[PDB]
Automatic annotation (TrEMBL), chains E, F:
Tetramer of two light and two heavy chains. Keywords: Disulfide bond, Electron transport, Oxidoreductase, Periplasm, Plasmid, Signal, Transport. This is Methylamine dehydrogenase heavy chain. It catalyses: 2 oxidized [amicyanin] + methylamine + H2O = 2 reduced [amicyanin] + formaldehyde + NH4(+) + 2 H(+). SUPFAM superfamilies: YVTN repeat-like/Quinoprotein amine dehydrogenase.
Amino acid sequence: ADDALAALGAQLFVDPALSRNATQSCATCHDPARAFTDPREGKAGLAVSVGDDGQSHGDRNTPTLGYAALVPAFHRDANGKYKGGQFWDGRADDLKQQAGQPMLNPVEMAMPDRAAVAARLRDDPAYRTGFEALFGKGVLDDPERAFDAAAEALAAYQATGEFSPFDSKYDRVMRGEEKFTPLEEFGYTVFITWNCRLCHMQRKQGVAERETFTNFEYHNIGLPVNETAREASGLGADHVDHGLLARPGIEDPAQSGRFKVPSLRNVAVTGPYMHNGVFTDLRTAILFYNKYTSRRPEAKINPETGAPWGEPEVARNLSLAELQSGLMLDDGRVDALVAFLETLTDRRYEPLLEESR
Amino acid sequence: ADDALAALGAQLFVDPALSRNATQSCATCHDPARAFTDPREGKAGLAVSVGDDGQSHGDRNTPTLGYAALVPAFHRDANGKYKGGQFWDGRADDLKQQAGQPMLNPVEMAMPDRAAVAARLRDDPAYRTGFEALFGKGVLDDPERAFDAAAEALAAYQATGEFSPFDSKYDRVMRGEEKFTPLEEFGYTVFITWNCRLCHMQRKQGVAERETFTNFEYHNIGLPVNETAREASGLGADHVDHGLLARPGIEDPAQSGRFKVPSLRNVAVTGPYMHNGVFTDLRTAILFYNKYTSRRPEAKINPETGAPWGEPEVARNLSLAELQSGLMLDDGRVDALVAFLETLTDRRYEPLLE
Amino acid sequence: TDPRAKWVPQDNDIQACDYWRHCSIDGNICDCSGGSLTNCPPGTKLATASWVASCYNPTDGQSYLIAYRDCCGYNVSGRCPCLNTEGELPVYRPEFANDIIWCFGAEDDAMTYHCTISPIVGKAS
Amino acid sequence: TDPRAKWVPQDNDIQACDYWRHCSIDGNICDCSGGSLTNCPPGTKLATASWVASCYNPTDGQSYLIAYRDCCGYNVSGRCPCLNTEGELPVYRPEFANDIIWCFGAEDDAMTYHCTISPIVGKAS
Amino acid sequence: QETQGQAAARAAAADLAAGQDDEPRILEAPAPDARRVYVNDPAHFAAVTQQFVIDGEAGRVIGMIDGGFLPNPVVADDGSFIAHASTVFSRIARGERTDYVEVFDPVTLLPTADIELPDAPRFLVGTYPWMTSLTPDGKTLLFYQFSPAPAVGVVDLEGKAFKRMLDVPDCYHIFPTAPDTFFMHCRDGSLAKVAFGTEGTPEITHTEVFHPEDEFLINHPAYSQKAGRLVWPTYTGKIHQIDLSSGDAKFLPAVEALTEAERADGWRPGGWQQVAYHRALDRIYLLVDQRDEWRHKTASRFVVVLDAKTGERLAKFEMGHEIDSINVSQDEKPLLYALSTGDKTLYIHDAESGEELRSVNQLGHGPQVITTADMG
Amino acid sequence: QETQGQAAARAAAADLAAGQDDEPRILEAPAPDARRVYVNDPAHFAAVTQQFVIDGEAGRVIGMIDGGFLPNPVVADDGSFIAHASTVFSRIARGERTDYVEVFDPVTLLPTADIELPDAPRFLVGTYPWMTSLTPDGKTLLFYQFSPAPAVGVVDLEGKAFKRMLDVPDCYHIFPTAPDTFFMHCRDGSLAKVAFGTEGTPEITHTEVFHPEDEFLINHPAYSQKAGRLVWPTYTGKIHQIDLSSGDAKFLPAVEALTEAERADGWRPGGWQQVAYHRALDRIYLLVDQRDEWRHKTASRFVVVLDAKTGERLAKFEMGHEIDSINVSQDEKPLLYALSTGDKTLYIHDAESGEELRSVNQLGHGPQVITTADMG
Ligand code: HEC
Ligand code: HEC
Ligand code: HEC
Ligand code: HEC
Ligand SMILES: [Ca+2]
Ligand SMILES: [Ca+2]
Ligand code: NA
Ligand code: NA
Ligand code: NA
Ligand code: NA
């Protein structure tokens, strides 16, 4: 039955009939050949994705669905912090609640309402058979039931081993099947002793059963606006992306500009980087953190542009206690971190590591 | 012959033939009934003494001759400091060089010159006899020899036990013959632990065989001018007493205002106090030192006058490192020090304290 | 007691210098001055920096990375001093070097050494 | 070594706590940090204040007053620590009281305790 | 049986086996209670010093506080704060001197105030608890000054500012009895009463002389502000008790802590904090041993306990260690604290039986002073 | 066999008996000489620290110098001054940090310069002598910075002012060879040569890689500035030697302080200052013992002495104490200094025979660093 639910989800996931002009499935933006991210070029490069209508652009980068099923449902943790949920701003409580949204979003799949989704599902005899077997007779003739059911199937599909195989080099080493290279080992050591570990490890102490290199908390690391992406989204030059504060029920201005810590799994292959795709190269995302610790002139410069990084989109609520570590990564340690993070690439994407590396 | 020299000095000491109008001897100003100090009242009270002419006053207080024979000749000590000598400014090397000076000073005994002194010595048949026995035939006929020899006799007399008997209560206590009262013992303890000890004990460490409560050094403790005395002396409102800088051969301005640390033996009976007689009462001289250490307003007031102590006559070269000790003497410690200092009174003067 | 002998870990007393997580501790154990194994004492400031070591736990036979974080901004505690150097490398390999005062990132820029905590931050290898 | 036994003076070694002049010393002997029995070590400032005691000298049978003047303006030496209290009176009799830091009158206002010198300053009585 | 290190090992191993996650953080100390005890280490005159905050019930260090040169600690009897008066220099032990008062939160141990005392006014002396003292409302701290003369500095803790120096007679120590009144002990053997609740000059009056010149009152009397009881031993273990609860000093009957036969067999008090007083029991505790007359600051191995009203001896404990200072918790079945400077250890005893229950070692270089709050 | 305390007791008694007077005063230490030795006590990370100035020949403390938190000491080889880089805080261990350099007259021990280092730039680490270093003309002090990155601070001792920080690569330690040049050791296993002017980027040249990645070079190499010899042991007692005397690095053949059999039987170097070098004899001294491979900071009970040219062992001394740190005087017939952190004692040995001649105890809380001048 769990099998059966996921297997239905698997069908929906690549079905373009869930988009208004039938051009677009979940898998168009979350492409399995690219660690469930969007390889397609748009007006802002690969920063933001283009919807079913062929011209609406989003304002955020399409994230991977790999390991998304390890993320807890939105809640407040034992230390009193918000944690978990789905979307870069956590506005969806969980995968089930997220899945319906791209379907109805006019900048994405653009179905006009739930009824229209139910009608598309009805048209397919396989869905009538598959859904009714799991949910009961007539599930597809009631729009809300059908919509909820489709969302559960997709959420189940995303919780299968396919999305979270734990077969990266890192997993192999931790299992004792092989060893890191010297450089990889140096990256591992640097990652766990430097500030990265305060945010990009599941646990504050002890060992995770299924590590996904994020604590699922929300942080403002003081990123600039991605000009070309913001342009393409049409939200307006004076728009401000408030992150977590956009979640309904969050009102506290202290949450403005904070985003969910992303799993670093497959990070080497899911460029460009950050919630707005502002940085093309992984090395650059690493270097960004030096702006808070290095004294030297070059730390203020984005090496992709040759100009200063830019002022934070949201200048308040920066995680300064964590970011201002008092230590700057030299080029050796940046190389080591790049080497370590490549070890977090799932086995099937290892050939993608080039891209000439 | 040591005995004989001093016996001759004993006669000279009380002989008024050594003064121009024959009205005064060493003993007129250095009166043995008053620990060798001057009991006569002049224009400035007991602060300064009146010479043979009945009119002229000095500008410094007449010091005791008791224990003066313990003061080393003027020299520079192992620490590099000037030490010893005679007169409050050390201008005389030793007692011998000092002794002729009152004889010839117009403000004191006022003899015109050495020849005049010799001619008085020659008029006395006992002196021709006594001096010739010690110094040879012709001694009184040569004014310089006569004058030197009289000085030597006087110096010898002052070195006798009569002047320095070491029979104060302090001396008796230290020989184990009696004990200090508790008040006197407190005073002793205060005197030895407070800054008094830095100047008023012979040695920086160790014990003296013959303690006279002075280190024989020169210090400016920042005293004011005694106006009634300065007036009586006639030296002028613009006069400055430069202390040790007045010694011939001393030229450093840093010595200006510094005076010889007096022996505190018999201090209780030799008021008034300081080089100028400025303070009448012993308690007042003690309280002076609180001006450098107390934060209280009363410490800036001379209790004898109800007015400020006064600007120092020489407001430079003060002994501030010793004086600014950081500790104030309360009244009970002042009482204690008065009781201790009275124990330094020679036995024959104990009746002077009642 | 023979200081030069191979160090033997135990899992029964965190105040002793042979407790297994202290295999590369240099200083004082925080639990002895009002902290705990993994928390700082009142009034001190918890660094975000650390040196690491792989420490063998005899109770489950696993090897864990311990991140030695300092509690800073007080004079040294003087209680339960310890210096172990299992895997400890010279200063030019600073991630494994334990003479360094690892107080960076502490609140109020505190940089004085008081004591050290011994939390597990991951698995060795 | 019996700390409660009557203290017994010797005149054979100035660095020991039974040296005769140390009968009411509290602190550290200055000879042990580069001073001498009666001089301060380099860099320290000699006080003019003191407590006093009557100490018996077993070389000559006499009782002398020792002035315990502190050498000030350095942290305590940590060498030859001694605390004797022969005759020592409580703080309200401060001339005989030795818990006080007798640094008054030292140069540059120095009031920290380094060590203590033991000069004789007069005969007892 | 199980030590605190063992328990913590056991708890840590269970958390790891259970996969319990926990945020490394700065702890807060437990709430102040009757069995909290503070130990100050003057460190044999070192330029910097430490105070240890100890749970006397578990025998556990629960916090520390750093201090400067010869600091004076105080602890509000109600548990609401702690403070000290302390002294630092700009180059360790040399340079510009700053005297200050710090007030601390007794659970976070953070400073809540730092009040500069102008002109470096503190008396620098081996540590006497009643040379710095709180008023019973907690709003004022009074500190003693010796140089150039006996004086008392007034610090307003509520407004966080130094107020003024008070000139006093030739007296010592500060025993506050009201928000505007304290007593001192005078050279002449009287107490002085100082009424200072005005910016103008204080009113100073003296008691009768209550001891003669050759009876020596130690540097560490016990004073219970809540009872107004001052317990003042002599070098022979004669005890003066003065009752300050009415506002004027009443002199209570003298009691001898030691018998005549004991005093002929060389018994005398000795140590640092030689005496303690438990208020609710009205009980005196005195450190005694057989000693030469001038070995009064050496450690003692015995504590005598006596009824304060009658003088009757209630116990004599063999302490089992070289003890320099004692105090007691003020709660019902009190602890007797016994601090060894030489061992740098606090021995924690049952006050009723005298038995050692537990101990806390490594308390600095030369710990000497024990303070408790009287929270009842 | 008359001790210094006995000698002094006799001289003082003679002075008393002769009635000799003398003014109590502040002493000057004797002229710096080859046998002066300095012992620094980092005090196990205490906020304040001490240095002892010792006459190695008499075995006498001749002076001390106070320091702050983990100070770095230096000694001019010609004996003209000493100095340190130090760190203090406004409230003991909390509050505003001040880093500074002090220069002292070596006979009066008075500070003759106090030079503030802006923005608190010192590296706070257990004390490694070559983390702060004098140029050979004495005019410049160079100190290491770790945070935010490796850097070197330039302090002008003659003009008494901080100049600027120099950017360097991922390198460690500071071995000056000229007024404007020094070497560092880099993570990659080369040395870096750094030549700097009054402004602009310094000239940085790397040598070849001279050791592999799994060979560990200790934190306390010996460097003779006057010989330009750097002597760098690894954890196994392999010793690298680098001749810098030309102004450029040349690598000497490696020697082994222990035999293959001794190593197989568990001999390894161990301690803090594990190596010493005598310039005029061209000899190397190494603390060694039998130890587990990860007990490299423990004391050792043996010193091996070898010819630096040939590697031949010249002696192996049983030191008879737990020794943490060694050094030698640079004169003829040198002393071998052996400092026990645990004993707080400097043991002074005959370097030729190994024999213990005298010792100096009570050197603080955890003394670790021995420094001498090479004045020849
Ligand atoms: C391109 C037009 C998209 C299509 C089609 C779908 N998704 Fe998507 N996805 C897209 C973006 C731009 C984002 C981030 C938007 C934001 O506001 O944060 C996402 C996010 C998700 C997530 C959240 C992952 C995380 O927060 O880590 C999930 C689970 C998700 N997407 C799933 C999903 C499914 C099931 C889809 C078909 C119904 C689907 N997406 C379509 C871009 C696009
Ligand atoms: C919390 C204070 C963090 C610390 C410290 C570091 N990271 Fe981070 N990281 C964090 C957030 C909240 C985000 C997303 C920010 C946003 O608004 O988009 C990130 C992102 C990354 C990425 C990009 C991942 C992706 O786009 O999929 C990388 C490669 C990354 N972080 C690496 C990283 C490293 C190496 C750090 C140590 C230098 C590090 N981060 C610190 C939160 C925090
Ligand atoms: C009053 C008119 C005096 C007569 C007659 C003599 N003396 Fe005098 N004496 C007098 C004064 C005012 C002073 C101090 C003067 C000064 O300039 O300092 C002195 C001092 C001496 C001293 C020095 C004592 C000391 O410095 O402590 C001696 C030794 C001395 N007097 C001896 C002396 C002799 C021997 C006299 C007769 C020949 C003589 N005095 C007469 C005031 C007067
Ligand atoms: C050196 C700095 C001194 C210190 C400290 C003290 N005294 Fe002194 N005293 C000193 C001098 C140079 C003099 C003469 C000053 C002058 O110019 O006249 C004195 C004088 C006295 C006196 C007067 C004695 C007399 O006139 O015969 C007394 C009673 C006296 N001094 C007492 C004394 C006390 C008790 C001290 C400690 C409180 C003390 N002095 C300090 C030099 C110095
Ligand atoms: Ca991306
Ligand atoms: Ca007079
Ligand atoms: Na862009
Ligand atoms: Na909201
Ligand atoms: Na007058
Ligand atoms: Na002259």
